């Protein structure tokens, strides 16, 4: 229902925690050029000398892809070069943080949620398909995620722009409310309710991740499928008589075998060209996912964002990053007002003959009453001379009513 | 130099990257300099030689957390920083005739 | 970028010298060592090999152009956000707090120069979330209450500046029983001697 004289104001609010997943890197692979076309044959190298520039381009291109996974891993999990210790005392005002911070007695340095994500996560070398291992282990990555998680719980946002500064958590959350337009007294009046809502939403997340991940197994699926695709090409002919070079060499002198060897060479070289171009496109797609995740790391975690729907859904408060195989997991802590009530409203108020405009609030009315409240939450205040400012007369305002203003200087006259 | 192998299981130093020949393993860890893989970073320090060590994560510092104490900056600085970005690349054009065929008539006829 | 272009051109030039299975790479030697009806297979092999080289060169240049355009759009957004006005995004106009920025030209590119605002020294202090005067709670307008341990002040959240606590720096919104951590300390009203 839309009207020219009405407004509805939030009265309660709820907190909720939202998950989003993004891939960060992908399996590194290096494919020899000679071995794939030629096994242990000496004559198979000689016919390949004419195309030596193709082997040098194909070996250089997978190296240039190989360094990109190292830059993608090195740009998201490293916004600080200081490892912040984790305090022993665990009282943070009633906000129970026993799930995202890692328990010391655990033998691995993951916490509980990283293990749930680790359990959800799902000879080849003879043909020359080598897999190189990533530069960083999951324990050192988990050391970086533990430093980043500790820095928001200890220093707020002023540790990634400068040297760390301590601050209790009770003022950190009130600093986050004034950034979205809410007075801080709503935090100080209802801390136990939000703390138990935050603990219940963490338990809801533990139940939701345990019941999904459709964007972190596919990137492994594409590489494993494409590798089996290059495997099956070893048994194709291309209009040849056999699929094994030593069988051609064992049965027919080399001059009477060059017509089969060149026909196998062009086909296998063409399949290498296909595999290399497919890896270049997927690597560029990963580069795009990596730069976007690095911006979310430097935007949601450090500082607070003024962009609607950049971190979660709702008015963003905090984030808590986690680490899982080949990808990051963000945990946004949004704020969503709940109950509302319809009310009569007015742009301005005339009293003395001067238009009284509200400072930071909006004028509301209950019929018998006239109050002012903050835009994003209900709290009724009487009209005073410290809550409005005067400007001009009352004839230029289309919608104005009459109501008396109490001067707080009346007892000052007594 | 220090020759490193990838899948070869053998100053021999055996790692998860392969077999490492010609570097003296030490227990003193440093900031990474030359990355090899699996957490191994080599350097040329002390005599000085090609040494092998496990990388050192960031730098340690103590954190101070109280339930009633705050810290307020009292001095500030001004500095400048740089960021380099490429905006364009060289424009090139290549003719489909001259490259494929030099001077010849049937080389043009075959390309119809 | 110059290195990548000079390699991509040099490989095109080097591929002219390979026969790709032929008995010579010189077209005039093909036309002199066979009749054209029998030299068409050598000409077709050179045609197929040079077309494969040109195909790879073109695909490589299409690939590089898309990344260069992505970097140009990123520099454009730094041009309209770092140079003009301030941003509130941290780690997107250089380390720490950013004031203004200064574009400088460079061959195939641009160099930005930020002026960063960084705190340095600090001092330890005993805080309080809120202060109970006479039944009412006094929350600071935008400050945070600090105290050396013998005097109580209020200041901004990023720079030291002691100021005497006053009724014009706090607003009341209830009582003291709903707030844990509140201390007992009186508040000065500057208007009382003004009434005398
Ligand atoms: C706003 O919503 C919260 C959460 O529902 C309310 O908190 C509950 O209040 C009732 C009061 O009887 C308690 O029994 C519950 O335990 C509280 N929390 C839960 C888990 O629901 C709060 O009272 C609501 N406030 C308003 C203004 O209605
Ligand atoms: C936090 O929750 C866990 C799991 O229920 C519990 O074992 C722990 O004691 C709780 N800690 C606090 C501070 O209540
Ligand atoms: C708004 O509240 C008034 C006062 O109770 C009531 O008369 C009216 O029906 C309400 N309007 C809506 C939108 O329900
Ligand atoms: C608001 O709408 C009502 C019903 O159409 C109308 O009578 C009244 O004049 C309107 N007031 C303004 C300020 O437009
Ligand atoms: C406010 O009071 C003036 C003077 O009596 C009157 O002319 C005007 O119509 C009133 N407006 C209302 C009813 O809000
Ligand atoms: C290397 O070989 C030795 C002897 O067979 C064996 O004990 C060891 O486990 C092997 N290590 C690896 C990395 O395979
Ligand atoms: C810190 O600030 C004070 C007062 O402005 C000044 O005297 C002192 O030289 C400054 N120290 C530094 C680190 O520049
Ligand atoms: C800090 O914690 C200690 C131990 O629980 C407690 O005695 C003290 O009152 C707390 N202080 C504040 C202001 O929270
Ligand atoms: C503060 O003063 C009130 C009233 O005298 C008293 O009841 C309360 O215990 C005092 N609290 C402290 C912290 O001294």
UniProtKB/Swiss-Prot annotation, chain A:
Segments for region (Heptad repeat 1): 191-238
Instruction: State what protein this is by name.
Output: Spike protein S2
Task: Note the effect listed for residue 91 to H.
Answer: In strain: B.1.1.318
Effect on the protein of changing residue 130 to N:
In strain: Lambda/C.37
Variant or mutagenesis effect after changing residue 218 to N: In strain: Delta/B.1.617.2, Mu/B.1.621
Function (record text): Precursor of the fusion protein processed in the biosynthesis of the S protein and the formation of virus particle. Mediates fusion of the virion and cellular membranes by functioning as a class I viral fusion protein. Contains two viral fusion peptides that are unmasked after cleavage. The S2/S2' cleavage occurs during virus entry at the cell membrane by host TMPRSS2 or during endocytosis by host CSTL.
- Provide the disulphide bond pattern: 33-55, 38-44, 300-311, 350-394
Kindly list the residues the record flags as site (Cleavage): 110-111
What effect is documented for mutating residue 159 to L?
A: In strain: Eta/B.1.525
Residues of this chain annotated as glycosylated in UniProt: 4, 12, 96, 342, 366, 402
Q: Which residues form a coiled coil?
A: 217-261
